[model samples]
Structure formats: structure tokens, C-alpha cells
Target: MQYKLILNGKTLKGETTTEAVDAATAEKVFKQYANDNGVXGEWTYDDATKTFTVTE
Candidate 1:
């Protein structure tokens, strides 16, 4: 599976995986990236679109 992460209408990052396929896994990955990169904001998963949004 592949995921696209966007911020402010720009492509911030992306990743491909063949691992877990669940919200928990996605949240874990997003949180870790944010923490490591010093990104401050709230992230939400939209089940309807299967996309995540980061708001500062």
C-alpha cells in the first residue's frame, strides 16, 4: 500500500508499505513522523477519502 501526505497544498512526504492495514498503524506512523520532524498540528483520518490531514 502507498500513502500520500500533504500539507498546505504541497506534497510533504510519501511512503509505500506492505505491512499493517489499519487506522492504528497509520496514526502511529504519522505521529512518529511529526514528532521527529517537529511538526505541530492535529492529524485526522478521513475514512471517506482514506487520507490524512495536518492542521497547524
Candidate 2:
């Protein structure tokens, strides 16, 4: 199964497979996006809400 990894109100759309979305997965996606976009900051994953947030 695959799950959506969202960051900053956008879907981190990619080709991958996983049973669920976890902190590890969320960070991996977030870091990749950050690097690609040259964004730097702290981010958090909310399991309860399935949300990824970036804050300065």
C-alpha cells in the first residue's frame, strides 16, 4: 500500500510503495523537496492528522 506524503499544503507526489506513511518517510520526502527548492527550516509530521508542516 501507498500513502500520500503532504508538505506545506502540497502533495509530495512520487513513485514509491509502503504500508504506511511514517516520520521517516515524511522527512525523506520533505528533505528532498527542500533540497530541490532550496528551502531550509524545521518540519514536523503529525501522524494524527497526516500532515507535514514547515516552520522557521
Candidate 3:
């Protein structure tokens, strides 16, 4: 499935879909992106919606 990263319930500019087998894997992808981009916040992964929500 496809995955997306959301901050404060909104998708950031130039953000793209992250592909993963499942939510567990998607969480890692999201973490890497967040870290590389210097985005710090609380993280939540939802398998049902396939989204990573970061609340700063």
C-alpha cells in the first residue's frame, strides 16, 4: 500500500507517497523522512488510513 506523512493533519508541500508492505514498515520510512528533514514531533502510525501523523 501507499503511505503519506501528515503534520498537524495536513500534508506538507512536495510530500510524496511512501511505499511499504504495511504500517509497521511505513512507520520506519516516516521516521527516516522526519529525521532527515529535521521534523521533530510525536509520531503516530495508522494502518487503516496509511498515514503518519506528526504533532509538534
Candidate 4:
């Protein structure tokens, strides 16, 4: 699995993994992106809507 972290229309970070994809994994990756860039945000996943949002 691979995840990309984009902020302000730019890619901040990415990760490659073999494990299954899930919300937990996305949250961890997003957290790393925030930590590296010194920003506060949240990653929300909507199963029903099949969408995600990251607010900073």
C-alpha cells in the first residue's frame, strides 16, 4: 500500500507499505506529515461517502 500526503496542493510526504490499507494507516501517515511540517490537522475518512478531508 502507498499513501500520499498533500498540503496546500503540494505533496508533502509519502509512504510505501505491504500491509493492508485502512484508516489507521492513513492517520499515521498524515500525522507524520503534520509533524514534519509543524502543522496541526486531522484526517477524516467517510466510509459511506468514500471521501477524506485533511484540515490544517
Clash pairs for candidate 1: none
**Candidates ranked, most accurate by TM-score first:** 3, 1, 2, 4
lDDT of 2 at 7: 38
Which 10 successive residues of model 2 have the least lDDT summed? Answer: 9-18
What are the RMSD figures for all models against the true structure? 3.9, 5.5, 3.3, 5.0
lDDT of 2 by residue, 1-56 (tens): 24334434243333322344566765676567666765546666565755556544
What TM-score does prediction 2 earn?
0.49
lDDT of 3 by residue, 1-56 (tens): 78987855234434447778877777887778777776767877576877777766
List residue ranges in candidate 2 displaced over 4 A: 1-22
Q: Which has the better TM-score: candidate 3, or candidate 4? A: 3
Listed per model in order, the count of residue pairs whose N, CA or C atoms clash below 3 Å is 0, 0, 0, 0
**Global CA lDDT computed for model 1:** 0.56
Q: Give the clashing residue pairs of candidate 4, or none.
A: none
- Measured against the true structure, the TM-scores of the candidates, in listed sequence, are 0.59, 0.49, 0.70, 0.42
* lDDT tens digits by residue: candidate 4, 1-56: 44444443244433323232876766676666566666655665455533344554
Candidate 4: list runs displaced more than 4 Å.
Answer: 1-20, 48-51
TM-score: which is higher, 1 or 2? 1
Overall lDDT per candidate, in order of appearance: 0.56, 0.52, 0.70, 0.51
Model 3 is weakest, by summed lDDT over 10 consecutive residues, at 7-16
> Residue-wise lDDT of candidate 1 within 1-56, one digit each (tens)?
44444433233444323233776776677667666766647666566655666666
Model 3: residue 37 alpha-carbon error in angstroms: 0.3
Error at 49, model 1, angstroms? 2.0
